[PDB]
Amino acid sequence: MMLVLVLGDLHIPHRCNSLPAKFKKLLVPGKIQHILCTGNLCTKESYDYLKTLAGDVHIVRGDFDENLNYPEQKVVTVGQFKIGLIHGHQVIPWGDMASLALLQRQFDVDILISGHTHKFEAFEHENKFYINPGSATGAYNALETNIIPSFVLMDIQASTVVTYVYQLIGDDVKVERIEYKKP
Amino acid sequence: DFADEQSLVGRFIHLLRSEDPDQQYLILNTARKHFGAGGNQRIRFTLPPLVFAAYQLAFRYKENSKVDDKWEKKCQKIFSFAHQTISALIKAELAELPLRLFLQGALAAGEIGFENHETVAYEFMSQAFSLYEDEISDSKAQLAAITLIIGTFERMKCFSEENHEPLRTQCALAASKLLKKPDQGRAVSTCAHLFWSGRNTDKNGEELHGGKRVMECLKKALKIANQCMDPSLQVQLFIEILNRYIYFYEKENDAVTIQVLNQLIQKIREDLPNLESSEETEQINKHFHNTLEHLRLR
């Protein structure tokens, strides 16, 4: 039974210099066996930090990442789950559910991870699961004047996922649980 | 080396946001001058954060929006600063980066609405378009760059029809003119969205919902499909244009008749079969099936 970490849109050092203080205290090596990164962390400096928390890291190219060597989108299988990854800027309109869904068909994935909007989202649609970690650094975004730092780690036992959303509201770190199981 | 001042700028940018607003513009300008004498291979990592600085500071000026009476004037100056900083990167023979930074500026000016914000936003957009024409030649970079321009323009609602119609048409042409037939087709259909969800200040906040124009867009897209001249991609481009039709159908765009969806699904049936068993050929069936399962016809 494996747990995966999902984050992105860190935007270091374009808009932020690092992940919030408390969050750093929660992400420590050993616990994570997988990492799916949506966003543009931008600097390779942030790729290394990621490479710390775990060894098997998956990253897709964001609209501001320096290294052009990342995949526009990638499909990674995690146990019984087939998961798609894409940054989001390629989905028009940007955070449109119908457009994300249209994308799900083409990929043929059970779960679809994307970011770009910097707004955490975890919902089910026509027997499929959609997750948007948000911005681990609460990175600025012209469309939304109030961004909330956050990441999300899911736990897969078998054909059943439980995604934990980590938000940074106020000082304390609130949390929320959401479960999804293959149709 | 040429990027060893990045971590450095991170702190700077971070702490900048704590000093008071009128204080920041001055500090941001000297940080510019300072890094400005840095070189040309350096400003690439150094100046961008300052650009986002400007943007965030532009919002800060508004959030102080009744305590100051010249906040709209400060915003105009800070956007003039960003325009400047970005032009610096172009001089240092950069394109991709500056094109995206102009887009961000366009979005920012749209959202803030200080006075003359529309004029500024339009300047930032055409400036982005200029880089697209002139400096971006690679086919791949194009599809990505034009798709980013369309996605950005689609979120903006500040333009008056007098400005929206030009950008709107300009995207369509850019799209139909891409290097390859494949990219040409995907892009042109993506423009569909500009005529449906796009918003001008004339319908008083409402989307134009031009079912008619959305159809012609996907129509031209189809024409592009029939020429792709390749079994595998030809069909694959058909399945995509089909899902796109569906996107508008389900949004209750009267123009998208069920007959049209049928004609396209049919053609796809008469072609999907002639493919060599592949890791791909199989996925194009799954894709088509997913699409048909979505329509409940499977």
From Swiss-Prot, chain A:
Disulphide-bonded residues: none
Tissue spec. comment: Ubiquitous. Highly expressed in heart, lung, placenta, spleen, peripheral blood leukocytes, thymus, colon skeletal muscle, kidney and brain.
CDD domains noted in UniProt: MPP_Vps29
Effect of substituting V91D: Impairs interaction with VPS35
Residue numbers carrying N6-acetyllysine: K51
InterPro entries hit by this protein: Calcineurin-like_PHP_lpxH (IPR024654), Metallo-depent_PP-like (IPR029052), Phosphodiesterase_MJ0936/Vps29 (IPR000979), Vps29 (IPR028661)
Binding site for Zn(2+) 1: D9, H11, N40, H118
Effect on the protein of changing N40D: No effect on in vitro protein phosphatase activity
GO cellular component annotations of the record: cytosol; early endosome; endosome; endosome membrane; intracellular membrane-bounded organelle; late endosome; retromer complex; retromer, cargo-selective complex
Signal peptide positions on this chain: none
Summary of the function given for this chain in its UniProt record: Component of the commander complex that is essential for endosomal recycling of transmembrane cargos; the commander complex is composed of the CCC subcomplex and the retriever subcomplex. Component of the retriever complex, which is a heterotrimeric complex related to retromer cargo-selective complex (CSC) and essential for retromer-independent retrieval and recycling of numerous cargos such as integrin alpha-5/beta-1 (ITGA5:ITGB1). Component of the retromer cargo-selective complex (CSC).
UniProt name for this protein: Vacuolar protein sorting-associated protein 29
Organism: Homo sapiens
Curated annotation (Swiss-Prot), chain B:
Tissue-by-tissue expression: Ubiquitous. Highly expressed in heart, brain, placenta, skeletal muscle, spleen, thymus, testis, ovary, small intestine, kidney and colon.
Chain intervals for the UniProt region annotation (Interaction with IGF2R cytoplasmic domain): 18-211
General function of this protein: Acts as a component of the retromer cargo-selective complex (CSC). The CSC is believed to be the core functional component of retromer or respective retromer complex variants acting to prevent missorting of selected transmembrane cargo proteins into the lysosomal degradation pathway. The recruitment of the CSC to the endosomal membrane involves RAB7A and SNX3.
Top-level taxonomy: Eukaryota, Metazoa, Chordata, Craniata, Vertebrata
Localization terms from the record: Cytoplasm; Membrane; Endosome; Early endosome
Disulfide bonds: none
Subunit structure: Component of the heterotrimeric retromer cargo-selective complex (CSC), also decribed as vacuolar protein sorting subcomplex (VPS), formed by VPS26 (VPS26A or VPS26B), VPS29 and VPS35. The CSC has a highly elongated structure with VPS26 and VPS29 binding independently at opposite distal ends of VPS35 as central platform. The CSC is believed to associate with variable sorting nexins to form functionally distinct retromer complex variants.
Disease per UniProt entry: Parkinson disease 17: An autosomal dominant, adult-onset form of Parkinson disease. Parkinson disease is a complex neurodegenerative disorder characterized by bradykinesia, resting tremor, muscular rigidity and postural instability, as well as by a clinically significant response to treatment with levodopa. The pathology involves the loss of dopaminergic neurons in the substantia nigra and the presence of Lewy bodies (intraneuronal accumulations of aggregated proteins), in surviving neurons in various areas of the brain.
Domain of life assignment: Eukaryota
Family, per entry: Belongs to the VPS35 family.
Protein name, UniProt field: Vacuolar protein sorting-associated protein 35
Interaction with SLC11A2: region residues: 1-298
Full-protein residues shown: 483 to 780 of 796
